[PDB]
Amino acid sequence: AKSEIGKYAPFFSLPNAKGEKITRSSDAFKQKSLLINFWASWNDSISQKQSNSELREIYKKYKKNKYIGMLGISLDVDKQQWKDAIKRDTLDWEQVCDFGGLNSEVAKQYSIYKIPANILLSSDGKILAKNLRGEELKKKIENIVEEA
Template identity: 35%
Template sequence: MKKIMLLFSLIISISTATAQMKIGDSLPDFQLKNNKETTINLAFLKGKTVLIDFWASWCGPCRVANKKLVPFYNQNKSGNFEIIGISLDIDTTKWKNAIEIDKLPYTQLIDPNGFDAKTALLFGIEQLPSAYLFDESGKLIAINPTLEEISIQLKK
């Protein structure tokens, strides 16, 4: 019986770990805390084109990507476009310091359990940075899109 339970829990954990967003999936509804300790529900994004950007303060490529995303966001924020940064940092102080250093003007959320975080498992995050572009109807239209691909979507 013990072996059966162990096998069952292994199967469950493998199927959970491989869950991942696919093109056409809807933006999941979840709540996370922002860098001001306020719980944010993603419902406020309805009707907007949204880039969900997974990153962490310790991730060098993420920090380089931030330097490109900030001016892109500043150029496009007056339209119907939002970027939501979701950090997989475990240390919230390092995360908040990175937000300040990188001067990230868009919404920053944290799911502080690293790659075991609920959102990381939901989206199937295996590496950072990882980004997901949702259209105005809330459907996933691109995974790890380039800024050019996002610009094309915003012009539609």
């Protein structure tokens, strides 16, 4: 219930590849809406590949945008496997992982029942949508950008 649409996002604070803790209020994301994608290198499935294709297109279009940010949260347990995937899969938006895996607190807090998954937050942290894909995702991001 804590991650249902319209609720405020549960807190997280998770380390990036350099070990810096990132939150929804880190400088890259403050005052922006935030698209958070969940994945793991141990699930390089067709669905994950599709999500990645879609997310690479969003990042390419919106990487230097005032209104929208992107964060990848991995459920990997192995740091080298995680970093290797970031490189191979060109996951060039910010990436975090605490190596807890399915036992990672963030996975429980966000009630992740499968991966890939995603969640979209307003700049005030409100949960706008979950598990958006395809044209619907495209349109929601376009709308956020238009709302300025």
